């Protein structure tokens, strides 16, 4: 069995190996990468996502989200308060202000320490989930707006034709902006490219141990657990590495820098934070190996998780028994 300790693997494809996206994912899995839940892919030196970022300040963040925390430093939830629209140029200036900027620090470890110590005492503003792409249309390799669609994968594997579309999303971050513990919708893969700016630190639980994290989460968030049998789908709960280590939960951590891709694998729980002003692009995708995970994915039916149009068909075809109750949640 490859990668039996479930370590995060880092890949350095050549320009030749960067041509065929599906093939390279399957290669990484042949080496055991999926067992970690997360992999890093460093693009060949010849590749670029686009020529420059000099012209992005006019993108609109229609609904910036102020991430307000409740709880204790190592175990908290966050709620998203909607703020007035602002441009990326306005957001960048905000991120760089004295109130929101990254503090002085020695290295990534010192910054990680300061994040876990102090996150809860601040409310950083996140421009999340903005439909769009920063890949140049002429970038032919690993262009996250040109991937094969999940609908087409399901059709190729299972024969059924379904409605729905699959497009990327932009994320504009600042110091302390936080992504809560989650897996993807329908336990899909994700791919995330850090276009510019400061790093993103990731934490991940191997897929084979995801239920251990769920059981801890039910213990740590007991009212939330009573409210919903899949409350991590709400994407609000944070648990620190120190607390994970105290409770024996297997995990790994890695920091992504600008110019790097990360892939999350089906049912790989992940969480993290941004080090300063940055812009990431991410999209879900599927492979044949995902289908079985899609069939078994939990679902939020309490009504809180409220997701995309395209998830309907996935539930309807892969989980027909759950369909009815899940759609009651969405309506
Ligand atoms: O970058 C972020 O804020 C969150 N991204 C993801 O969870 C992902 O790419 O799967
Ligand atoms: Mg612009
Ligand atoms: Ni994710
Ligand atoms: Zn729910």
The 3-class SS string of the chain reads: CCCCCCCCEEECCCCCCCCCHHHHHHHHHHCCHHHHCEEEECCCCCCCCCCCCCCCCCCEECCCEEEEEEEECCEEEEEEEECCCEEHHHHHHHHCCCCCCCCCCCCHHHHHHHHHHHHHHCCCEEEEEEECCCCCCCCCCCCCCCCCCHHHHHHHHHCCCCCCCCCCEEEEECCCCEEEEECCHHHCEEEEEEEEECCEEEEECCHHHHHHHHHHHHHHCHHHHHHCCCHHHHCCEEECHHHHHHCCCCCEEEEECCCCEEEECCCCCEEEEECCCEEEEEEEECCCCHHHHHHHCCCCCCCCCCCCCCHHHHHHHHCHHHHHHHHHHHC
Q: Which of 267, 263, 294 is nearest to 160 (CA)?
A: 294
Half-sphere exposure of 275 (CA within 13 A, CB side): 23
CA-proximal residue: ligand 1, atom 9 (nearest): 192
Kindly give the distance from the C-alpha atom of residue 66 to the centroid of ligand 1, in angstroms, as a whole number.
Answer: 17
80-306-292-266 Cα dihedral, nearest 10 degrees: -10
CA 110 to each of CA 80, 102, 107, 117, 137: distance values in angstroms, whole numbers, following the listed order:
27, 12, 5, 11, 39
Kindly give the distance from the C-alpha atom of residue 57 to the centroid of ligand 2, in angstroms, as a whole number.
Answer: 4
Ligand 1 close to Cβ of residue 282 (< 6 A): yes
Solved using? X-ray
Residue 326 phi/psi, 5° resolution? -70, -40
Ligand 1 atom closest to Cα of residue 179? 3
Helix 311-318 and helix 150-158, axial crossing angle in degrees, nearest 10: 20
CA 128 to each of CA 61, 72, 117, 168, 262: distance values in angstroms, whole numbers, following the listed order:
8, 24, 24, 12, 17
Q: Which of 147, 254, 258 is nearest to 195 (CA)?
A: 258
Question: CA-CA distance, 89 to 279, in Å (whole number)?
Answer: 12
> 241 near 203, Cβ under 8 Å?
yes
> 83 near 65, Cβ under 8 Å?
yes
Q: Is 158 annotated as a binding residue?
A: no
Kindly give the distance from the C-alpha atom of residue 231 to the centroid of ligand 4, in angstroms, as a whole number.
Answer: 5
- Ligand closest to Cα of 193 equals 1
Residues belonging to the chain: 331
| Residues contacting 229, CB < 8 A, separation 6+ | 298, 301
Give the resolution to one decimal, in Å. 1.4
Question: CA-CA distance, 224 to 236, in Å (whole number)?
Answer: 10
Q: Which residue has the tokens 């093939």?
A: 23
Question: CA-CA distance, 201 to 40, in Å (whole number)?
Answer: 12
Q: Are strands 38-41 and 9-11 parallel, antiparallel or unpaired?
A: parallel
> 176 near 264, Cβ under 8 Å?
no
Q: Which of 172, 194, 179 is nearest to 262 (CA)?
A: 194
Residues surrounding ion ligand 4 at CB below 5 Å: 228, 300, 302, 304
Kindly give the distance from the C-alpha atom of residue 262 to the centroid of ligand 1, in angstroms, as a whole number.
Answer: 9
Residue ranges making up the domain that contains 78? 1-331
CA 246 to each of CA 73, 118, 180: distance values in angstroms, whole numbers, following the listed order:
14, 20, 19
Q: Indicate which CATH number applies to the domain containing 285.
A: 2.60.120.650
| Residues contacting 318, CB < 8 A, separation 6+ | 186, 291, 294, 295
Q: Which of 38, 21, 57 is nearest to 143 (CA)?
A: 21
CA 235 to each of CA 177, 217, 232: distance values in angstroms, whole numbers, following the listed order:
13, 12, 5
Token pair in block for residue 210 = 């995801």
Token pair in block for residue 138 = 């002429």
Q: Is 98 annotated as a binding residue?
A: no
Ligand 1 close to Cβ of residue 171 (< 6 A): yes
Q: Are strands 189-197 and 261-264 parallel, antiparallel or unpaired?
A: antiparallel
Calculate ∠ Cα 17-18-20, nearest 5°: 85
Question: CA-CA distance, 252 to 305, in Å (whole number)?
Answer: 26
Ligand 1 close to Cβ of residue 264 (< 6 A): yes
Ligand 1 close to Cβ of residue 192 (< 6 A): yes
CA-proximal residue: ligand 1, atom 2 (nearest): 179
Question: CA-CA distance, 325 to 331, in Å (whole number)?
Answer: 10
Calculate ∠ Cα 253-259-262, nearest 5°: 40
Q: How many domains does the chain have?
A: 1
Ligand 1 close to Cβ of residue 280 (< 6 A): yes
Strand order in the sheet with 270-274: 178-182, 270-274, 200-204, 252-256
C-alpha of 75 from chain center: 20
Half-sphere exposure of 54 (CA within 13 A, CB side): 2
44-49, Cβ contacts within 8 angstroms, sequence gap of 24 or more:
44/12, 44/13, 44/14, 44/15, 44/17, 44/18, 46/15, 47/15, 47/18, 47/139, 47/141, 47/142, 48/139, 49/134, 49/135, 49/136, 49/139, 49/143, 49/193, 49/195
CA-proximal residue: ligand 1, atom 7 (nearest): 179
**Residue 66 CB coordination number (10 Å):** 14
**Residue 312 CB coordination number (10 Å):** 17
């Amino acid at each position: 069995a490859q990668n039996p300790n479930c370590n995060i693997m880092i890949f350095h494809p050549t320009k030749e190996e960067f041509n065929d996206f599906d093939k390279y994912i399957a290669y990484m899995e042949s080496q055991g990468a999926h067992r970690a839940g997360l992999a890093k892919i460093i693009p060949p030196k010849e590749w670029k996502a686009r020529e420059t970022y000099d012209n992005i300040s006019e993108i609109l963040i229609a609904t910036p989200l102020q991430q307000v925390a409740s709880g204790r430093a190592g175990v908290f939830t966050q709620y998203h308060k909607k703020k007035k629209a602002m441009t990326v140029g306005e957001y960048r200036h905000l991120a760089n202000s004295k109130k929101y900027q990254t503090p002085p620090h020695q290295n990534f470890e010192d910054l990680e320490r300061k994040y876990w110590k102090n996150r809860i005492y601040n409310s950083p503003i996140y421009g999340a989930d903005i439909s769009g792409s920063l890949f140049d249309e002429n970038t032919k390799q690993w262009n996250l707006g040109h991937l094969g669609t999940i609908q087409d994968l399901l059709e190729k594997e299972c024969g059924v034709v379904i409605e729905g579309v699959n497009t990327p999303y932009l994320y504009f971050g600042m110091w302390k902006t936080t992504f809560a513990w989650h897996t993807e919708d329908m336990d899909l893969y994700s791919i995330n490219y850090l276009h510019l700016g400061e790093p993103k630190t990731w934490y991940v639980v191997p897929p084979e141990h995801g239920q251990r994290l769920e059981r801890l989460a039910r213990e740590l968030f007991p009212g939330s657990s009573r409210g919903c049998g899949a409350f991590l789908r709400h994407k609000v709960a944070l648990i620190s590495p120190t607390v994970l280590k105290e409770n024996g939960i297997p995990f790994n951590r890695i920091t992504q820098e600008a110019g790097e891709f990360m892939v999350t694998f089906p049912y790989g729980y992940h969480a993290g934070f941004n080090h300063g002003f940055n812009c990431a692009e991410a999209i879900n995708f599927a492979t044949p190996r995902w289908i079985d995970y899609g069939k078994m994915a939990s679902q939020c039916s309490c009504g809180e998780a409220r997701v995309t149009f395209s998830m309907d068909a996935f539930v309807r075809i892969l989980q027909p028994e759950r369909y009815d109750l899940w759609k009651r949640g969405q309506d």
